[PDB]
RNA sequence: UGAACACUUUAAACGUUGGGUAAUAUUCGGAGGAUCGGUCAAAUGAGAAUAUUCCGGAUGGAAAGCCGAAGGCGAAAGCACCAACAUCAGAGUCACUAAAGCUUCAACGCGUAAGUUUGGGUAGCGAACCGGAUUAGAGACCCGGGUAGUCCAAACCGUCAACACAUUAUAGUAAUCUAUAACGCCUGGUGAUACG
């Protein structure tokens, strides 16, 4: 696994517009790690250095020091290495020395730094959640508020996103209880057109074939 | 009957005469060569050019 | 996938073997992400 | 590959219709109209 | 989005009214498709044939 | 023509600050490059090839397995666009 | 009665037209119709006077209602439609017909 | 080279002669050593715009497609075949590759 | 290097033939009875016979309106309705060829647009000729009708801030970084027009 990876690096090191000698240890030590092969939007383990009232000083290791507003920071992003959110008496006592879970939005600004903000965009949490759950249909319900009716179904504001449940996967009593919160199940989304498809969790998932 | 339809498809009768003259152009390359499949000797060059100008 | 490539097999069979041989950390991660999902909501 | 083109043109030469039964093919195609509201696929 | 078969040469109304035709009898330009520009130009040619066709 | 091309490319990259000088090789370019490496005007030369347009298998320049210094044109015109 | 209206506005002149449902046209009203010429015709008041006139004419016509079909990109045309709504002669329909 | 023809047809005639019109075009491509692959209509569609500035025929027009393999010599008779008949208005003839990737 | 073949990929490359069009002014009957045109602003006229318009019909050819863009193809000028014929071209892969390569003195072709000879008739466009305007005269700018020409097919002309003002080609990483190969041109300004 080591030798085959090294020879894969050397074999792809061939066919380049220079002779490129004395630069293969560069790729060897790149391949163990030092940078991850796709960056934009990928969450990291980052180190908090100091916390002020507003701006928190967090390591990047990639362009120096990161800056996040503290009013977005919770204890939920404090990635302990054991699997639990840490037992702390308050909810934003991020002591410097912990490992923090933040997303790089860009690696470089106009202003010398990166963005690197886990914004605690709850809508983006539901975006990553429901996109992963679209994948995870192959491998628990989601709450929504029904708002108004029209042709073919009911309008559901699910977790900050407005969807529209079709008539076939709809329950009957959702007609007579419009306005209250109840749980629903995701089916799919169409990202090119912004249409989100749901169902009632009491309505059984009879197989909609993947029209692609 | 259907194989007769296939051989009337695969004939050179149906093609556009760009493609018909290109097929007889590799017929000429099979003629003029010194060799089995020589396509760049100058005899091949002048054979192609003389037929082309005709 | 790449070390199965230079072993001699083609790309898609390597992708399938990589799906079998590293899926366990994927369900561990999706359990962790559902835990973070219940944490945030 | 020329043999494969020969093979898939010989085996798909039924729907490729014959000259003698033009009239019956017209009468066996006019009987059913064809969908146009959404996009037609291949064939 | 860029599934070539049924979109590359096909002049029928569905794909173009979905993603290629502006509502007022007009077309959707290059900036409103986010598609490879030569392939976009050829299917724009196909659509613009289809604005000469009896359909549209 | 190859002498003036050699010394012109020397004049080129000296006044342009490029410390590598890369020529279409010949008998002259190889031999007189060995001359100016021998007198120490430069520190060395190697044949290189624009390896991006090498084929699925052309012959390729292995620096280690080849002996260190070519001394004729035919060994340096075997390959493609050195 | 039922009428159809075509409104055309040009920088020199603004026109509101009173016409039959069949679209046969009884009349067309313009800033020029109110006699404004050039810049006054350009001015909003000239369109408004034709609009007041069109409403008075529609009542004389006895068409309580005339559909209004708008035409042209002009500002003066906009004043005229408003003046009529303020006027209260009631459009059989209000719509934009520009081609 | 197989040739699609998404050509128009008169809207509501009794079908006793439009079928005969396609028999005539089938006879025309029947000659010259080639034949139709499939004759797929679309029934009828009302059109998008009026045509025939003389006589004002109108929309609601009929649709037919030929899909015939032909040597290039037969096109000029096909041009006469689509030009002389006043029951048809427009005709679009397109080349298609030898993968038989038709419409 | 230069060139021909087999695939991959290219579109406003080129000429011919058939069909179309938002849109155009003229016209045949009908709605409707004084405005339209137009401009910083004013002025001949359409019109008491019916104007802008509006209905629906005919005419006939211009131009390809959006697409479509610090986009493409071209040797350059240039090239922007399709469909088909049609002849290329250019790039990449994979193979042939072993200097047939570079430049162009001379010669010779291409050559936007005007202009002339020939044939007609013509949506729109826009020199004359008459009419009015900022001003003292106004010949122009601008309002107003509008003829050759712009349209077609054949010929002649060949000149120009026809510019990358960046010669062409090779060799280096899109040059004005610059060695060379053949070139073409300049030699202070005003004076290039007249002859041949």
Q: Which residues pair with A57 in a beta bridge?
A: A50, A67
Residues whose CB is less than 8 angstroms from the CB of residue A3 and which lie 6 or more positions away in sequence, other chains included: none
> Any atom of strand I under 7 A from CB of G99?
yes
Residue B49 CA, nucleotide I15 C1', distance (Å): 22
Surface of E (17-46) touching H: CB under 8 A: none
User: Residue F48 and residue A21: Cα distance in Å, rounded?
Assistant: 11
Torsion of CA G17, G23, G27, G28, to 10 degrees: 20
**Is F51's CB within 8 Å of A19's CB?**
yes
Helix (H) or strand (E) holding B42: helix B42-53
Q: At how many Å resolution was this determined? A: 4.2
Strand I–CB F55 distance below 7 A: yes
Q: Do chains A and H touch (3 or more CB pairs under 8 A)?
A: no
Helix ranges, chain A (H):
2-13, 24-32, 122-135
Q: Obtained via which technique?
A: cryo-EM
Contact between G81 and G96 (Cβ < 8 Å) = no
Check: CB of residue G11 under 8 Å from CB of residue G43.
no
Residues 6+ apart with CB under 8 A from E13: D36, D37, D38, D39, E50, E55, E56
Please state the φ and ψ torsions of residue D30, each to the nearest 5 degrees.
Answer: -75, -15
Nearest 5°: phi and psi at H36?
-65, 145
Closest residue of B to D11, CA-based? Answer: B2
How far are the Cα atoms of B33, B41, B44, H16, H97 from residue B25, in angstroms, in the given order? 12, 15, 10, 50, 21
CB within 8 A of D26, min separation 6: which ones? H19, H22, H23, H26, H39
Touching C: A residues 88-147, CB under 8 Å: 120, 122, 125, 128-129, 132, 136, 139-140
Q: Do H72 and B17 touch (CB under 8 A)?
A: yes
Q: In DSSP terms, which residues pair with H3 in a beta bridge? A: H68, H95
Axis-axis angle for helices A122-135, C23-40 (nearest 10) = 150
Burial class (CB in 10 A: 0-12, 13-18, 19+), A9: middle
Report the alpha-carbon distance of residue A119 to residue A103 in Å, rounded. 8
Question: Are F38 and F67 in contact, with CB atoms under 8 Å apart?
Answer: no
Q: For residue F73, with 0-12 CB atoms within 10 Å meaning exposed, 13-18 middle and 19 or more buried, which class applies? A: middle
Q: Where are the beta strands (DSSP E) in E10-55?
A: 21-22, 26-27
Any H CB within 8 A of D4 CB: no
d(CA H101, C1' I88) / Å: 27
Distance of alpha carbon A163 from alpha carbon A152, whole angstroms:
12
Beta-ladder partners of E21 = E27
Q: Which nucleotides of I are covered by protein (CB under 7 A)?
A: 1-6, 9-12, 17-23, 30-42, 51-55, 57-60, 65-69, 71, 81-88, 92-98, 100, 170-173, 177-181
Closest-CA distance, B17 to chain H, in angstroms, reads 9
Beta bridge partners of A198: A186
């Amino acid at each position: 696994s080591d030798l085959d990876d090294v020879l894969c690096r050397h074999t792809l090191r061939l066919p380049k517009p220079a002779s490129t000698g004395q630069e293969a240890a560069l790729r060897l030590l790149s391949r163990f790690n030092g940078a991850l092969p796709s960056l934009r939007g990928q969450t990291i383990l980052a180190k908090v250095l100091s916390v002020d009232s507003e701006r928190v000083t967090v390591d990047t290791g990639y362009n120096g020091v990161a800056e996040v507003p503290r009013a977005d920071v919770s204890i939920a992003h404090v990635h302990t290495a054991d699997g639990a959110a840490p037992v702390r008496p308050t909810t934003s006592d991020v002591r410097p020395g912990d490992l923090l879970r933040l997303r790089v939005d860009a690696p470089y600004t106009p202003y010398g730094d990166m963005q690197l903000t886990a914004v605690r965009e709850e809508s983006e949490f539901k975006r990553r959640l429901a996109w992963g759950e679209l994948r995870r249909a192959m491998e628990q319900p989601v709450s929504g508020r029904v708002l108004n009716d029209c042709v073919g179904g009911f309008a559901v504001g699910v977790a900050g996103f407005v969807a529209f449940l079709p008539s076939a996967m709809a329950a009957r009593d959702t007609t007579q209880r419009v306005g209250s919160l109840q749980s629903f199940r995701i089916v799919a989304m169409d990202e090119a057109r912004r249409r989100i498809t749901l169902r009632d969790a009491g309505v059984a998932a009879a197989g909609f074939r993947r029209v692609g | 009957s259907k194989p007769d339809l296939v051989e009337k498809l695969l004939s050179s009768d149906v093609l556009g005469k760009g493609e018909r003259r290109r097929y007889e152009r590799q017929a000429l390359i099979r003629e003029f060569q010194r060799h089995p499949a020589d396509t760049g000797s100058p005899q091949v060059m002048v054979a192609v050019w003389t037929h082309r100008v005709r | 996938q790449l070390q199965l490539m230079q072993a001699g097999a083609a790309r898609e069979q390597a992708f399938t073997q990589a799906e079998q041989e590293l899926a366990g950390r994927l369900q561990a991660l999706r359990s962790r992400l559902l835990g973070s999902a219940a944490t945030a909501l | 590959a020329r043999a494969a083109r020969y093979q898939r043109l010989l085996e798909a030469s039924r729907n490729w219709i014959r000259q003698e039964d033009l009239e019956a093919a017209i009468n066996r195609a006019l009987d059913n109209p064809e969908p146009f509201g959404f996009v037609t696929s291949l064939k | 989005v860029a599934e070539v078969l049924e979109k590359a040469d096909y002049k029928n109304v569905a794909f173009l009214t979905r993603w290629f035709l502006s509502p007022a009898g007009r077309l959707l330009p290059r900036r409103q498709t986010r598609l490879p520009v030569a392939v976009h130009k050829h299917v724009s040619r196909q659509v613009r044939l289809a604005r000469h066709m009896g359909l549209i | 023509n190859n002498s003036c091309t050699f010394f012109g490319s020397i004049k080129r990259d000296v006044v342009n600050g490029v410390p590598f000088c890369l020529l279409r090789p010949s008998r002259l370019a190889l031999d007189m490059a060995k001359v100016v490496r021998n007198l120490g005007i430069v520190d060395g030369f190697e044949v290189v090839q624009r390896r991006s347009r090498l084929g699925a298998h052309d012959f390729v320049w292995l620096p280690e397995q080849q002996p260190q210094e070519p001394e004729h044109l035919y060994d340096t015109s075997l390959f493609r666009q050195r | 009665l039922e009428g159809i209206v075509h409104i055309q506005n040009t920088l020199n002149n603004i026109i509101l037209t009173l016409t039959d449902k069949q679209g046969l046209i009884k009349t067309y009203t313009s800033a020029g119709v109110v006699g404004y010429k050039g810049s006054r015709k350009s001015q909003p008041v000239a369109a408004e006077k034709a609009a007041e006139e069109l409403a008075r004419r529609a009542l004389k016509l006895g068409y309580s209602s005339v559909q209004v079909r708008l035409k042209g990109a002009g500002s003066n045309k906009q004043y005229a439609v408003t003046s009529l709504a303020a006027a209260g002669l009631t459009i059989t329909s209000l719509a934009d017909v520009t081609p | 080279p197989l040739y699609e023809l998404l050509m128009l047809a008169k809207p509501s005639l009794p079908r006793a002669e439009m079928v005969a019109l396609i028999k005539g075009l089938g006879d025309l491509v029947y000659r010259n050593g080639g034949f139709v692959t499939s004759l797929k209509s679309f029934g009828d569609q009302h059109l998008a715009y009026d045509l025939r500035r003389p006589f004002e025929k109108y929309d609601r027009a009929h649709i037919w497609q030929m899909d015939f393999v032909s040597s290039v010599d037969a096109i000029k008779p096909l041009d006469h075949g689509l030009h002389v008949n006043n029951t048809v208005l427009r005709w679009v003839l397109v080349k298609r590759p030898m993968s038989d990737k038709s419409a």
